[PDB]
């Protein structure tokens, strides 16, 4: 899963806040 991917965490933080 891209979930555990360190390179995708900032993208998830941006999507979760939006």
């Amino acid at each position, epitope marked *: 899963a891209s979930l555990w991917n*360190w390179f995708d965490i900032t993208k998830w933080l941006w999507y979760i806040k939006k």
Partner: antibody
Framework: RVQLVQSGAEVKKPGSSVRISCKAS????????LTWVRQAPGQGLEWMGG????????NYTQKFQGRLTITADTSTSTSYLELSSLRSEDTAVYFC?????????????????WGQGTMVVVSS | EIVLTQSPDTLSLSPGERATLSCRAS???????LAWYQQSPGQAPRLLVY???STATGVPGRFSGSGSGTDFTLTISRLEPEDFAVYYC?????????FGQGTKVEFKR
């Protein structure tokens, strides 16, 4: 616009450690990745590791695990690299770089803003 | 660890000519998290292309990227004298991040 200013050049004896700083002028810092890249004299770029400051979450390539520490301070928008057990192969320019931001504010993964570099010479 | 192999090692061209640089990966870059950087002597690297094919803001329009899977290409449609430098590809798909070994664009003679 956004600029990363790094600390001055260093001369270190082998076996010692070095600490270098990277401060961002303005812009988003806590929710964007900050990566450290080094370049030995005459060779190419080497991705060492990075940190997500809000989560205090680092990630290091296996080559440096045990000698490398990357931290961040969100109040001053500053990141610190620390490399211990220095050897002659560690002589390089060390670059600080911040994740590029996209169409809305979408993190783009690539390194968009670069510091000016800090030269570290390992010599006795 | 994903290994990136650039080719050729040195590209020898003249101003006004077209430059085609290659970057091949050991593993499929499934979300096209591939970037290209430029570096001149004594200066920090500069981002040119992100997402395999999106040229960064402020980068001249003669730079463009293409490709997918394991084969990616940076094209400089018409070389200007300031374009004679070293270019690096880099993947940010799976940690750790990794660079290619670099390609030098030199003056033909």
């Amino acid at each position: 616009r956004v600029q990363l200013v790094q600390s001055g050049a260093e001369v270190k004896k082998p076996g010692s450690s070095v600490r270098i700083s990277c401060k961002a002028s303005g812009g988003t810092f806590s929710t964007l990745t900050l990566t450290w890249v080094r370049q030995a004299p005459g060779q190419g770029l080497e991705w060492m590791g990075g940190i997500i400051p809000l989560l205090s979450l680092p990630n290091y390539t296996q080559k440096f695990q045990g000698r490398l520490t990357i931290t961040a301070d969100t109040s001053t928008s500053t990141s610190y690299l620390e490399l211990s057990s220095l050897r002659s192969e560690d002589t390089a320019v060390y670059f600080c770089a911040r994740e590029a931001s996209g169409w809305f504010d979408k993190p783009l993964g690539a390194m968009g803003v670069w510091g000016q570099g800090t030269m570290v010479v390992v010599s006795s | 660890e994903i290994v990136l192999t650039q080719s050729p090692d040195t590209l020898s061209l003249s101003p006004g000519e077209r430059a085609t640089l290659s970057c091949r990966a050991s593993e499929t870059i499934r979300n096209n998290n591939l970037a290209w950087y430029q570096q001149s002597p004594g200066q920090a690297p500069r981002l040119l292309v992100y997402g395999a094919s999106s040229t960064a803001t402020g980068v001249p329009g003669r730079f463009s990227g293409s490709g997918s899977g394991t084969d990616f290409t940076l094209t400089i449609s018409r070389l200007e004298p300031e374009d004679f430098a070293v270019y690096y590809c880099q993947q940010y798909y799976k940690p750790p991040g990794t660079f290619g070994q670099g390609t030098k664009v030199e003056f033909k003679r």
